[PDB]
From a paper:
The TRAPP complexes are nucleotide exchange factors that play essential roles in membrane traffic and autophagy. TRAPPII activates Rab11, and TRAPPIII activates Rab1, with the two complexes sharing a core of small subunits that affect nucleotide exchange but being distinguished by specific large subunits that are essential for activity in vivo. We report a cryo‐EM structure of the entire Drosophila TRAPPIII complex. The TRAPPIII‐specific subunits TRAPPC8 and TRAPPC11 hold the catalytic core like a pair of tongs, with TRAPPC12 and TRAPPC13 positioned at the joint between them.
However, in the regions of TRAPPC8 and TRAPPC11 located on either side of the core the local resolution was suitable for de novo model building. An α‐solenoid is also seen for TRAPPC11, with residues 181–566 forming fifteen α‐helices that includes the interaction surface with TRAPPC2L. This region of TRAPPC11 has been referred to as the “foie gras domain” after the zebrafish gene in which it was first analysed as it was noted to be particularly well conserved between species (Pfam domain PF11817). The N‐terminal part of TRAPPC11 (residues 1–180) consists of four β‐strands interspersed with four α‐helices. The C‐terminal part (residues 567–1,320) is less well resolved but forms the arm connecting to the vertex with TRAPPC12 and TRAPPC13. The surface of interaction between TRAPPC2L and TRAPPC11 has a total area of 558 Å. The overall arrangement of the interaction is similar to that of TRAPPC2 and TRAPPC8. As was seen with TRAPPC2, α‐helix 1 of TRAPPC2L is central to the interface and interacts with α‐helices 14 and 15 of the TRAPPC11 α‐solenoid. We could identify two conserved regions in TRAPPC11 that are involved in the interaction. α‐helix 14 (Tyr442 to Ile453) contacts TRAPPC2L between Asn33 and Lys42. The other region is between residues Asp478 to Thr486 at the end of α‐helix 15, where residues such as Trp484 contact TRAPPC2L α‐helix 1 and the loop between β‐strands 1 and 2, similar to TRAPPC8 and TRAPPC2.
Residue numbers in the entry: 1 to 60, 76 to 377, 406 to 566, 579 to 626, 676 to 718
């Protein structure tokens, strides 16, 4: 009829490769088969240029398509069914035990040809003539034993191959691979012809079976490296899907199929390096899809799948990087990494909506749809969101794009906020806030500042909390004055260590958590000036440091401190007595204080605001 091409992801993520089989071989031989398999794993030892694509696997109206009709047929074709069958055996040249070799290899090839009769596959046999090498044209018993084979089965002579000694076995394995390339491409072409002949007939114009056929056609082509032909048959299948009706119960499956198709064709793009072509196909179909659905769209569908769309395309971005293309990433390291990240954000928001529509009183299996939601309720951790953010983070960091990755970092911390996970949010914010002050732009600086307020109060890193709060009061004039007053009260509280006021948010658990704090914690702008330095060991300096408050609200005028320095030798507007210098120290030392540390109101500004000298 019109059955799905496949509902199976995680398929052929690596470059698809042929498979030729090896039978169930016992441990008794596996040791020497080790060497045997070594040559086989030699395909994985050698460079891709030397490496043959094929690998190994083990086993013990109109008429309906055979080999195409179902997606498990596709997959079983992919790896379960080898294009060619090869059974490796040993052949010691002897007299009558070698006749027993004849009978035994006859039995095994009889079983093998029965299996082939099940599944229409070409066969080859490999024999180690473990004896010493001899010239070709010497062993008539080779012909005799081939004839014993043929009367048993009829396998052609040339399909027989020999790997006498390991030092010989290696080269004979290389040419084995070459011959296998031969037969494998032969079988692949034969199946290609099968598909095209199938496609020339319609079972009463079902029109979707042929879609499966052209899909499998692309499979064949990419097996045979004709990437262009197969990718364009894929795209033609996309066109065919377009011709199909939309918005039915199928349209979601249509969208997923087109996702498969976009995946494959974009692979074949970047293999052929047609970048903007891949971009155009990507967009074209994805906005097709956004149009095609207006609802249901429970938005773990067509939104999460949108996320997976950008996920696969990011996969193909990194695939290009492994290939080495710098184009789109000089443009945008991952155009779609963070994009899929915001798509999983909308995923989670839609999940919140799902909970909302659930909070309604919540017969065509809508409960299963609700059960869908329950399934969708599972993928609500949104930690995978955080990880996708991490990949986008690193991906943009690849070309050292600090700003963008930093703002994705504040994204991460915001998400941890949404999840209620204050800790690591606070960590990333702790990194960002000095950065944001370095960007000098106070607006978002303050916005992440109140975010940090929430983060630290929830965490209880009240040292960090108050540091951000105080550099916030520095220039908090963009915010409410009364909240400045409240926060200043919080400042005196924390300096005393007594619980801070924003109990309007606080709940007792984290409250106690930070009550634990500050037992360990150990430690608006004004100006420093000098009337005289570099003295003649007679001068007397004095308070040239103008203590200015740029906060509208005052801080309680408590007290003062000055800290002595040792270079060379050891020795609105509010001003009050300090007599900072009356100690007649030694000459030519400019004691410029690291930080002010006078006791106005409380200890200090601590967060790194102190000037040098005159």
């Amino acid at each position: 009829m019109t059955m799905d091409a496949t509902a199976l992801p995680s398929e052929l993520l690596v470059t698809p490769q042929p498979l030729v089989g090896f039978c169930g071989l016992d441990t008794a031989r596996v040791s020497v088969h080790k060497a045997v398999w070594e040559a086989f794993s030699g395909s994985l030892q050698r460079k891709a240029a030397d490496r043959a694509a094929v690998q190994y696997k083990l086993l013990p109206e109109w008429y309906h398509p055979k080999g195409i009709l179902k997606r498990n047929w596709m997959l079983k074709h992919l790896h379960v069914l080898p294009s060619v069958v090869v059974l490796f055996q040993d052949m010691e040249w002897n007299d009558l035990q070698w006749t027993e070799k004849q009978v035994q290899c006859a039995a095994i090839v009889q079983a093998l040809k029965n299996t082939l009769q099940e599944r229409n596959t070409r066969l080859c046999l490999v024999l180690l003539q473990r004896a010493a090498p001899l010239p070709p044209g010497e062993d008539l018993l080779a012909a005799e034993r081939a004839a014993s084979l043929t009367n048993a089965c009829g396998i052609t002579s040339k399909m027989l191959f020999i790997l006498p000694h390991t030092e010989h076995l290696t080269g004979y394995a290389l040419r084995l691979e070459s011959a296998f390339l031969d037969m494998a491409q032969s079988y692949y072409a034969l199946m290609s012809k099968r598909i095209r002949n199938h496609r020339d007939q319609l079972t009463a114009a079902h029109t979707s079976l042929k879609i499966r056929h052209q899909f499998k056609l692309g499979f064949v082509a990419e097996m045979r490296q004709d990437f262009s032909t197969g990718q364009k048959h894929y795209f033609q299948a996309y066109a065919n899907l377009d011709e199909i009706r939309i918005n039915d119960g199928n349209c979601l499956e249509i969208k997923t199929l087109a996702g498969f198709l976009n995946y494959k064709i974009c692979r074949l793009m970047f293999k052929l390096k047609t970048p903007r072509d891949a971009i155009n196909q990507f967009i074209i179909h994805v906005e097709k899809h956004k149009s095609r659905v207006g609802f249901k769209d429970l938005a773990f569908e067509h939104h999460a799948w949108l996320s997976t769309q950008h996920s696969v395309f990011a996969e193909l971005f990194c695939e290009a990087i492994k290939n080495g293309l710098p184009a789109l990433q000089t443009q945008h390291p991952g155009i779609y990494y963070h994009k899929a990240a915001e798509f999983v954000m909308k995923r989670r928001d839609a999940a919140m909506e799902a909970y909302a529509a659930m909070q309604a009183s919540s017969v065509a299996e809508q409960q299963a749809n609700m059960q869908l939601c329950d399934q969708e309720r599972s993928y609500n951790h949104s930690a995978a969101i955080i990880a996708l953010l991490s990949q986008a983070m690193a991906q943009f960091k690849i070309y050292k794009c600090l700003r963008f990755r930093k703002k994705l970092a504040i994204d991460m911390a915001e998400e941890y906020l949404k999840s209620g996970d204050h800790a690591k949010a606070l960590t990333l914010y702790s990194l960002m806030l000095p950065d944001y002050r370095q960007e000098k732009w106070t607006t978002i600086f303050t916005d992440v500042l109140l975010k940090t307020l929430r983060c630290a109060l929830l965490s209880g890193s009240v040292a960090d909390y108050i540091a951000c709060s105080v550099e916030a009061l520095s220039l908090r004039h963009q915010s409410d004055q009364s909240e400045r007053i409240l926060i200043l009260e919080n400042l005196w509280q924390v300096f005393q260590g007594v619980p801070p006021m924003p109990k309007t948010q606080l709940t007792p658990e984290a409250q106690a958590l930070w009550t634990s704090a500050l037992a360990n914690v150990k430690s608006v702008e004004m100006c420093a000036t000098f009337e005289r330095v570099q003295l003649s060991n007679d001068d007397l300096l004095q308070l040239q440091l103008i203590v200015r408050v740029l906060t509208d609200i005052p801080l309680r005028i408590r007290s003062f401190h000055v800290i002595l320095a040792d270079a060379g030798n050891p020795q609105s507007y509010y001003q009050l007595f300090c007599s900072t210098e009356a100690q007649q120290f030694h000459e030519n030392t400019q004691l410029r204080i690291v930080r002010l540390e006078a006791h106005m109101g409380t200890d200090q500004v601590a967060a790194l605001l102190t000037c040098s000298s005159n």
